Write a protein that binds this ligand. Structure first.
Ligand SMILES: Nc1ncnc2c1ncn2[C@@H]1O[C@H](COP(=O)(O)OP(=O)(O)O)[C@@H](O)[C@H]1O
Lengths: 459, 577
């Protein structure tokens, strides 16, 4: 308030603070200086001697001499409001649009708690994306988490923001009134450059859909501390959507590489001994909790989708940061150079990629019947052809039988047109058709995974 | 002001006592000599002195007196054609007072105090102004060297001395505010002077290395990174920019790079001509060099001054190209403090700050309109050095995924003999789509298509490479060995320039562009050669291949027609055979 002053020992980003008692672990406070500017610092480690507060920013200028610290509030957090729904905000939760703040309806503890198991209701629903391939072969089901493993320089972001706007759940195909349920895309990146920061806002505003989405985006340079809380924000805000009003959310976090890069620093200073290959011991846990914001919960009808997209450095699937995820998130959708070099877009491979849970997706009495078998068609068909494309280099083409010679050509039409999709949006129904057509190229009575009926109605 | 003495001196760091009221990061003077200090930690009333130069020969109980300003280079007209120590001290004058030794106990001035200058004013007195509003234009070489309001000053004028020679120190503007503007103005380093606002970029930063201009390239606001082990050309690819970039100011600064590579640019650089005037090219040049050999802490100072210089010029209106030569040593330098002050570190012992002071740096600028309403660009292409070769190592990696435009410089490439060969199967730029407008119009209207087909072979070629090492080039037949060889030539001739061949070491687009169209053709017609019934085998051994060979060497003047001659030679030299 007025009060607690005579701060001794400040080295770099750490700070000890004289006798407080009031404080609590997980408190947050205003530091005030000799020039009126104010700074913030979280309450970590406290005793009967001192507490520990942590300069968020720079600390340029401070003094042994008095320059007090103001207790802000218990366990800080933020409220919410339906108002929020077309804004531009930074980290903590302040207006970056330039239009006055929110006005609550609630305050929300920002430790997100954990669910219960019984409460959760098994997924069974479907979601379109508007991208093709990631709906046809391996289909984002509803109330589902799933992540896009990118490479170092393959273009994640774009393949992000398309799948930002594009999606719209069609309940239509299942049967029920249309506007019984609306769609909320909740989006948060971080470690974004002045450059990146602009590619979003341009696309977002373009046709606009800001008016059905919430922003959160913690600049690159911005203090490393707030970074840590940043996602948890847009996660918890997501709750307030579906559980108190029903909605259908799509949360898309991004670049969780940053999430740990940034993480480490905190832990490295606040003390601990880092475990295996760095990445502070309690990662498993800490990472876990930023993914239990998902699934439908009986009775309640709305729910959360996670797609967090991140990049590896070692360009593997063995470095921990992604590997780890791959135990709790449930699938994998990679991007290869191969596609991308040849110039396609958005390059999402086939075969590396597969959503483990997707059976309770698409169905005969849920959203189109034949989809099942399309999915296991084009997959297994595909891989058969990608060998030939290499072995043709050793024996010429004068030694391919007829049936199989066609399985070469399949690949070309698949790769050139099918996984390319520029800016064209599509839909689950238009997409299944295309597929079919291409399959017609190879000889019939052979695609023996698929059942005869369907072929008798489509070709 | 605030003063105490040495308590504990041992290593580049010291702990004084009897001190309070200090502020974080503050210049000071320690020892009878006076040396330049920094406040980096406090503990009751004792403070860790960080001591910028050397040490040795000290006793406990010697002066320790702060002034309480926290670092800053004093910026104003006349700075080019010089060299500058880590706290911007002109070594010329130093050399003139020492001999041939960088000696402690030195104080001079940043901008020389003698020279007076031809003034011109703009605004009339009795007028209003706000922050960073232009005031006077003192001319300076081929440049026009404006002067601004120092940011965050606003008020109303009251007199203006008219034209004539005038001192640097002089107050040549008075205000009704009791304030005084003089030529220069001091500005911190830890801060980051604003601008009017942030904006997207789209103008290519030309560079003339075909490899940096047809494949990977850079936006004007560009940020990139160049790494490669020892002996890899790391330095020399920044040499070229320093003498063939396309902008107002090269501000080459390297920290921890040897003399030899610096001094050289101080004896060659006088006798050359810029692509933007005709004058001694050295006008667009900074050099704040601070070679490895010097002190410890200076290595930390060094960079952030040349970042600031990078703002300072932008500010006036120009087009900054800053490049730090070998920023990685900086990490090592930072971490040498650490060790002595006992901060537990994160992996590979770097103190956890790698991100902290990295990430602020690289984000800095590009195409940002100023307070003056000019188009300001900050172009940085950061050099780094790993210490292994394992790009897995933290300080390296942290660069990626903080900046775009990554170039990697392969190691095993270079041992053979090319330069500035890079792996393009490592590399990747991001900036490459928002360059399309400018390219279309400026260069050719069909260029990006014609380039993607080059990458069409080039990145696909590995497709075969692997199979070569699995069963030889043997039993790879003919659409096979077509490609292999095409591409063979593609890197043998479209990817290797020099920095020492007398000519041919700089190109315009339109020239380069040319080379590149040929090869496509050659591919095309070859494709139709084998399909028709003959074979590459002899085609390789055609004389016309070698013409495509040597090709790059002729200069521009000839270039049109050179290129036209092969444009005839193709269609005849296929159909015939
Ligand atoms: N463009 C070039 N033309 C000719 N030789 C080059 C070229 N680039 C590099 N080299 C040769 O290879 C060396 C590699 O550069 P070097 O100065 O060792 O770089 P660094 O040590 O900073 O990696 C050069 O010194 C030069 O001998």
């Amino acid at each position: 308030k007025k009060e607690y002053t005579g701060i001794t020992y400040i080295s770099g980003p750490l700070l000890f603070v004289e006798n407080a008692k009031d404080l609590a672990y997980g408190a947050i406070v205003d530091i005030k200086d000799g020039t009126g500017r104010v700074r913030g610092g979280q309450v970590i480690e406290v005793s009967e001697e001192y507490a520990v507060i942590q300069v968020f920013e720079e600390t340029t200028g401070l003094d042994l001499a008095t320059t007090s610290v103001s207790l802000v509030e218990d366990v800080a957090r933020l409220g919410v409001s339906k108002e929020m729904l077309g804004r531009r905000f930074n980290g903590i939760g302040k207006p970056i649009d330039g239009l006055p703040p929110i006005t609550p309806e609630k305050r929300l503890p920002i430790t997100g708690l954990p669910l219960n198991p019984v409460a959760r209701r098994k997924p069974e629903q479907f979601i379109q994306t508007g991208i093709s391939t990631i709906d046809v072969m391996n289909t984002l089901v509803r109330g589902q988490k799933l992540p896009i493993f990118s490479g170092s320089g393959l273009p994640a972001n774009e393949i992000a923001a398309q799948i930002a706007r594009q999606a719209t759940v069609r309940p239509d195909l299942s049967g029920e009134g249309e506007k019984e349920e609306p769609f909320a895309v909740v989006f948060a990146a971080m470690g974004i450059t002045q450059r990146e920061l602009s590619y979003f806002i341009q696309e977002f505003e373009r046709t606009g859909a800001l008016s059905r989405s919430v922003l959160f985006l913690n600049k690159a340079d911005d203090p490393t501390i707030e970074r840590i809380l940043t996602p948890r924000m847009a996660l918890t805000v997501a709750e307030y959507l579906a559980f108190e009003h029903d909605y259908h959310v799509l949360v898309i976090l991004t670049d969780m590489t940053n999430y740990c890069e940034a993480l480490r620093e905190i832990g490295a200073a606040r003390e601990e001994i880092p475990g295996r290959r760095g990445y502070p011991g309690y990662m498993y846990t800490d990472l876990a909790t930023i993914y239990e914001r998902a699934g439908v919960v009986e009775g309640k009808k709305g729910s959360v989708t996670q797609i967090p997209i991140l990049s590896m450095p070692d360009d593997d699937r063995t470095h921990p940061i992604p590997d780890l995820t791959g135990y709790i998130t449930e699938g994998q959708i990679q991007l290869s150079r191969e596609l991308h070099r040849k110039g396609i877009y958005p390059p999402i491979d086939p075969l590396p990629s597969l959503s483990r849970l997707m059976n309770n997706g698409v169905g005969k009495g849920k959203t189109r019947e034949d989809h099942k078998q399309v999915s296991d068609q084009l997959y297994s068909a595909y891989a058969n052809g990608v060998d030939i494309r290499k072995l043709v280099a050793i024996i010429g083409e004068d030694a391919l039988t007829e049936n199989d010679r066609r399985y070469l050509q399949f690949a070309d039409a698949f790769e050139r047109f099918f996984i390319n999709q520029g800016q064209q949006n599509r839909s689950i129904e238009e997409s299944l058709q295309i597929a079919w057509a291409l399959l017609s190229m190879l000889p019939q009575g052979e695609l023996k995974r698929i059942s005869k009926d369907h072929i008798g109605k489509y070709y | 002001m605030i003063q105490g003495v040495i308590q504990k001196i041992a290593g580049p760091a010291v702990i004084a006592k009897g001190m309070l009221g200090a502020r974080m990061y503050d210049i000071c003077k320690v020892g009878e000599e006076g040396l330049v200090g920094e406040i980096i930690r406090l503990d009751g009333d004792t403070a860790f002195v960080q001591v910028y130069e050397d040490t040795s020969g000290l006793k406990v109980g010697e002066p320790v007196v702060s002034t309480g300003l926290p670092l800053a280079v004093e910026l104003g007209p006349g700075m080019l054609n010089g060299i500058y120590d880590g706290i911007q001290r002109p070594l010329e004058r130093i050399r003139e007072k020492t001999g041939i030794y960088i000696t402690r106990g030195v104080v001079v001035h940043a901008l020389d105090r003698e020279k007076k200058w031809a003034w011109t004013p703009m605004v009339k007195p009795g007028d209003e102004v706000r922050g960073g509003m232009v005031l006077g234009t003192v001319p300076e070489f081929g440049f026009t060297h404006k002067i601004l309001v120092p940011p965050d000053v606003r008020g109303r004028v009251k007199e203006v001395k008219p034209a004539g020679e005038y001192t640097v120190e002089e107050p040549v503007v008075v205000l009704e505010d009791g304030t005084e503007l003089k030529m220069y103005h001091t500005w911190p380093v830890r801060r980051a002077r604003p601008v009017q606002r942030k904006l997207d970029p789209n103008t290519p930063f030309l560079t003339g290395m075909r490899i940096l201009d047809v494949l990977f390239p850079v936006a004007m606001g560009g940020t990139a990174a160049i790494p490669g082990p020892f002996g890899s050309g790391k330095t020399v690819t920044q040499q070229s920019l320093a003498k063939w970039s396309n902008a107002d100011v090269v501000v080459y600064v390297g920290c921890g790079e040897r003399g030899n590579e610096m001094t050289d640019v101080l004896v060659e650089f006088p006798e050359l001509t810029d692509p933007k005037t005709g004058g001694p090219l050295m006008h667009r040049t900074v050099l704040i060099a601070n070679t490895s050999n010097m002190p410890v802490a200076a290595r930390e100072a060094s960079i952030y001054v040349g970042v600031t210089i990078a703002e300072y010029f932008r500010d006036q209106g120009f087009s900054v190209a800053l490049m730090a030569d070998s920023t990685s040593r900086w990490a090592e330098a930072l971490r040498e403090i650490s060790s002595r002050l006992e901060e537990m570190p994160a992996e590979e012992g770097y103190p956890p700050y790698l991100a902290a002071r990295l990430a602020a740096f690289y984000e800095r600028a590009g195409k940002v309109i100023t307070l003056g309403g000019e188009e300001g660009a900050v172009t940085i292409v950061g050099a780094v050095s790993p210490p292994g070769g394992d790009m897995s190592e933290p300080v390296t990696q942290s660069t990626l995924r903080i900046v775009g435009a990554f170039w990697r410089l392969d190691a095993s490439l270079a041992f053979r003999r090319h330069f500035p060969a890079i792996n393009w199967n490592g590399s990747y730029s991001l900036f490459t789509s928002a360059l399309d407008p400018w390219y279309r119009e400026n260069v050719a209207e069909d260029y990006p298509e014609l380039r993607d087909a080059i990458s069409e072979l080039l990145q696909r070629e590995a497709g075969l490479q692997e199979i070569v090492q699995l069963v030889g080039p043997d039993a790879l037949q003919d659409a096979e060995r077509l490609v292999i060889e095409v591409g063979r030539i593609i890197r043998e001739d479209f990817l290797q320039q020099n920095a020492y061949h007398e000519v041919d070491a700089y190109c315009s687009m339109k020239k380069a562009y040319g080379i590149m169209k040929m090869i496509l053709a050659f591919y095309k017609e070859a494709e139709a050669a084998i399909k028709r019934g003959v074979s590459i085998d002899e085609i390789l051994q055609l004389p016309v291949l070698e013409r495509i060979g040597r090709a790059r060497y002729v200069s521009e003047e000839e270039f049109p027609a050179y290129f036209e001659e092969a444009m005839k030679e193709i269609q005849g030299a296929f159909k015939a055979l």
